Write an enzyme that holds these catalytic residues in place. Sequence first.
Site, PDB file in Angstrom:
ATOM      1  N   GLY A 141      41.466  32.425  38.171  1.00  0.00           N
ATOM      2  CA  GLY A 141      41.919  31.882  39.445  1.00  0.00           C
ATOM      3  C   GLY A 141      40.749  31.364  40.245  1.00  0.00           C
ATOM      4  O   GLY A 141      39.872  32.141  40.620  1.00  0.00           O
ATOM      5  N   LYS A 159      37.144  35.025  37.223  1.00  0.00           N
ATOM      6  CA  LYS A 159      37.642  35.402  35.897  1.00  0.00           C
ATOM      7  C   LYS A 159      37.733  36.924  35.845  1.00  0.00           C
ATOM      8  O   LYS A 159      36.865  37.595  36.397  1.00  0.00           O
ATOM      9  CB  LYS A 159      36.667  34.917  34.805  1.00  0.00           C
ATOM     10  CG  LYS A 159      36.658  33.413  34.580  1.00  0.00           C
ATOM     11  CD  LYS A 159      35.586  33.012  33.590  1.00  0.00           C
ATOM     12  N   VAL A 160      38.784  37.465  35.211  1.00  0.00           N
ATOM     13  CA  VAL A 160      38.977  38.917  35.023  1.00  0.00           C
ATOM     14  C   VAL A 160      38.841  39.194  33.525  1.00  0.00           C
ATOM     15  O   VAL A 160      39.462  38.507  32.704  1.00  0.00           O
ATOM     16  CB  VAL A 160      40.295  39.509  35.616  1.00  0.00           C
ATOM     17  CG1 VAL A 160      40.310  41.037  35.531  1.00  0.00           C
ATOM     18  CG2 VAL A 160      40.481  39.096  37.046  1.00  0.00           C
ATOM     19  N   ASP A 212      52.055  37.939  51.601  1.00  0.00           N
ATOM     20  CA  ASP A 212      52.257  37.158  50.391  1.00  0.00           C
ATOM     21  C   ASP A 212      52.689  38.032  49.204  1.00  0.00           C
ATOM     22  O   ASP A 212      52.350  37.697  48.073  1.00  0.00           O
ATOM     23  CB  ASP A 212      50.924  36.409  50.088  1.00  0.00           C
ATOM     24  CG  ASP A 212      50.987  35.278  49.070  1.00  0.00           C
ATOM     25  OD1 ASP A 212      51.866  34.376  49.219  1.00  0.00           O
ATOM     26  OD2 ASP A 212      50.164  35.290  48.119  1.00  0.00           O
TER      27      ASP A 212
HETATM   28  C1  LIG Z   1      51.605  39.478  29.256  1.00  0.00           C
HETATM   29  C2  LIG Z   1      50.468  39.661  30.193  1.00  0.00           C
HETATM   30  N1  LIG Z   1      49.980  38.716  30.969  1.00  0.00           N
HETATM   31  C3  LIG Z   1      48.963  39.297  31.677  1.00  0.00           C
HETATM   32  C4  LIG Z   1      48.844  40.640  31.307  1.00  0.00           C
HETATM   33  C5  LIG Z   1      47.902  41.640  31.845  1.00  0.00           C
HETATM   34  C6  LIG Z   1      47.241  42.524  31.000  1.00  0.00           C
HETATM   35  C7  LIG Z   1      46.367  43.465  31.507  1.00  0.00           C
HETATM   36  C8  LIG Z   1      46.136  43.542  32.874  1.00  0.00           C
HETATM   37  N2  LIG Z   1      45.250  44.504  33.390  1.00  0.00           N
HETATM   38  C9  LIG Z   1      44.465  44.459  34.524  1.00  0.00           C
HETATM   39  C10 LIG Z   1      44.436  43.353  35.373  1.00  0.00           C
HETATM   40  C11 LIG Z   1      43.630  43.440  36.502  1.00  0.00           C
HETATM   41  C12 LIG Z   1      42.871  44.595  36.765  1.00  0.00           C
HETATM   42  C13 LIG Z   1      42.993  45.608  35.842  1.00  0.00           C
HETATM   43  N3  LIG Z   1      43.758  45.567  34.749  1.00  0.00           N
HETATM   44  C14 LIG Z   1      42.165  44.370  37.988  1.00  0.00           C
HETATM   45  C15 LIG Z   1      42.488  43.130  38.445  1.00  0.00           C
HETATM   46  C16 LIG Z   1      41.972  42.589  39.662  1.00  0.00           C
HETATM   47  C17 LIG Z   1      41.511  41.309  40.011  1.00  0.00           C
HETATM   48  N4  LIG Z   1      41.113  41.277  41.270  1.00  0.00           N
HETATM   49  N5  LIG Z   1      41.318  42.549  41.747  1.00  0.00           N
HETATM   50  C18 LIG Z   1      40.987  42.894  43.123  1.00  0.00           C
HETATM   51  C19 LIG Z   1      41.832  43.350  40.806  1.00  0.00           C
HETATM   52  N6  LIG Z   1      43.384  42.535  37.562  1.00  0.00           N
HETATM   53  C20 LIG Z   1      43.952  41.263  37.704  1.00  0.00           C
HETATM   54  O1  LIG Z   1      43.703  40.535  38.630  1.00  0.00           O
HETATM   55  O2  LIG Z   1      44.792  40.959  36.708  1.00  0.00           O
HETATM   56  C21 LIG Z   1      45.502  39.679  36.805  1.00  0.00           C
HETATM   57  C22 LIG Z   1      45.023  38.816  35.693  1.00  0.00           C
HETATM   58  C23 LIG Z   1      46.962  39.973  36.734  1.00  0.00           C
HETATM   59  C24 LIG Z   1      46.792  42.663  33.721  1.00  0.00           C
HETATM   60  C25 LIG Z   1      47.665  41.722  33.211  1.00  0.00           C
HETATM   61  N7  LIG Z   1      49.824  40.870  30.334  1.00  0.00           N
HETATM   62  C26 LIG Z   1      50.109  42.106  29.603  1.00  0.00           C
END
Ligand SMILES: Cc1ncc(-c2ccc(Nc3cc4c(cn3)cc(-c3cnn(C)c3)n4C(=O)OC(C)C)cc2)n1C
Length: 262
Positions: free
Chosen positions: A19, A23-24, A132
Amino acid sequence: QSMSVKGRIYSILKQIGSGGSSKVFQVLNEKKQIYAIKYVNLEEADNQTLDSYRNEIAYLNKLQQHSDKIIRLYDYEITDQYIYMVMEWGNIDLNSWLKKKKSIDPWERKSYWKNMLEAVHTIHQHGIVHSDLKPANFLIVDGMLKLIDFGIANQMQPDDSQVGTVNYMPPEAIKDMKISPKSDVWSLGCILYYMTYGKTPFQQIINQISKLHAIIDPNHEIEFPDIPEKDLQDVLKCCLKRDPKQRISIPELLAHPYVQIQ
Ligand SMILES: Cc1ncc(-c2ccc(Nc3cc4c(cn3)cc(-c3cnn(C)c3)n4C(=O)OC(C)C)cc2)n1C
């Protein structure tokens, strides 16, 4: 590929999301423990954007000690060029989960609803109104929902950058052109409505302009079909009152039979 955060080395397993200039990543430390690392490129960031990231980090840091329903922030590194944020790793966000699921267990729905109320109540106590709220703001971490953003900085999409949604928008926000902790009650209400009926209250309206008109029209009655959980139906009706003064509050929702009795 690897990265260093406060003298600690992490190996990158994959990119979870993106975003804007952030990047995460799904990473491992030296003890092979899993984390989520958010990397933010600050090279083309203005003072308004810098302040938004500083404010998010500050609120994440403060709120750690107030609720376990806010994502854990373990460490971070901030320079003039970048931000690294070391956080707890979650299995999936609520939005991607609601897409996979054919139907939800009433006990899972209830548990998720309580976590959402606790997370949102905590941010309200610190003077934050999210404004939001949507299912993608919640993350599943060990069968528990945790809030991952405060509506202060850039939103992450799992790995179209135009993608938005008006489906959870409170009427007062549209009218005001007002926004109070009651605005988040309406958005939480729309999420519970989704988890109950399988659609958001105004999903069927195709045109986004007609949708905004329906959200603010008191003449547009939201349908609440009969369901076995009468307490759930009552929660839904209280959340989706167009007048925010009439709308139920979060302290009241926490004392409701739906959350307290099973
Ligand atoms: C089908 C699918 N699409 C996306 C996913 C998916 C898979 C694993 C995650 N895990 C995850 C996402 C995370 C975090 C920690 N764990 C921390 C964050 C985060 C980013 N900024 N802040 C303040 C926190 N985070 C995050 O932002 O995830 C987004 C991509 C949904 C999140 C989403 N899956 C399973």
